[PDB]
Design a protein around this ligand. Sequence first.
Ligand SMILES: OC[C@H]1O[C@H](O[C@H]2[C@H](O)[C@@H](O)[C@@H](O)O[C@@H]2CO)[C@H](O)[C@@H](O)[C@@H]1O
Length: 386
Amino acid sequence: MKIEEGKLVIWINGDKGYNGLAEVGKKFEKDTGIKVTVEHPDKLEEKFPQVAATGDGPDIIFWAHDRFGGYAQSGLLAEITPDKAFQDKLYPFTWDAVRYNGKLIAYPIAVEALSLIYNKDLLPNPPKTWEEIPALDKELKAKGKSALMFNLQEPYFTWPLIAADGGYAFKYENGKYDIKDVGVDNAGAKAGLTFLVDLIKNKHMNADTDYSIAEAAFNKGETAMTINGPWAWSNIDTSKVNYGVTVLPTFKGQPSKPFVGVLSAGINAASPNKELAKEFLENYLLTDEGLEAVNKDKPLGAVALKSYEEELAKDPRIAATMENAQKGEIMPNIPQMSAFWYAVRTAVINAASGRQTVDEALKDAQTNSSSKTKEQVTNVGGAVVT
Ligand SMILES: OC[C@H]1O[C@H](O[C@H]2[C@H](O)[C@@H](O)[C@@H](O)O[C@@H]2CO)[C@H](O)[C@@H](O)[C@@H]1O
């Protein structure tokens, strides 16, 4: 109703291959007459639940699977209906990532994990440990370069270090995540965040560094290393930088443990075009030709579609992505994930900027993460005085 019948509107993050996705949309339109419009709103993962709560928003939303349990619990995502032959085309573990309360609530697209990206002309042998980074930066600074820059504003990028020596989100046991058993303020989490904060205090990193600042610096050759996902490789290809993609550094001898996302496509529960969305996703996007179009724009990572992953696997960068994914953990998709991420975002930004100590910051994050959230998608705009 509110979403227009007879067309598809799609939202996807602006760092992904939205132009390639639009090409698949234009093919669909040429074949079927059905217009497909791709948009990449800022903060789409916050906008979606707000507008979808009223029956508006896109027909299809692309995001990592971790947000989708919350959306489904709120009644905002449709159960999908792929048949067995279709399900056979994708890796079983990717279907598990989009299963919520026994139901499939999105189409898996690709497996995303962070890797260490390095400039082979500044650093032909990248460091195997976090511990050696301060000395490396000291050496490079004397010559007008830095060792490492990555996004310090989103906790996704610092999580691998927090988790390395023992940090965790929710304990999983016997078919359930226990929201009362959270691992954000244990000794391992404290050790990792303390190491990051010390890097900042010793002027090896800047607390204000964000995604754009880090990407620009790496791609200009000002910093020897960054931490990012497969989507970023396209812009580095364009840049003058000769780069490699490798395993994340260890911390206290333990592998960094990135939280692994499955980029997924959910169908708005209010869409009058659920059948059109199914046809588009199963018969146009999740094909070798469709994924190629998106992947050529911005790499997806290790795709869920078996036939195309076999092609993409011939690539040391994908081998590295998989190595890092296997050392980390697939994110939970439970509704509590939103609270978890907001809590850890606050702790990381506050500790990095010197607004809180590490102990103070993570104690707060532990409290909010483990608080069973009576969640609402209501807002002030619908409020009425009674
Ligand atoms: O930083 C917290 C943030 O992490 C994840 O978002 C990732 C996403 O998985 C990637 O596809 C890519 O877009 O980078 C994002 C971080 O900027 C979680 O998916 C998200 O819920 C969480 O807020």
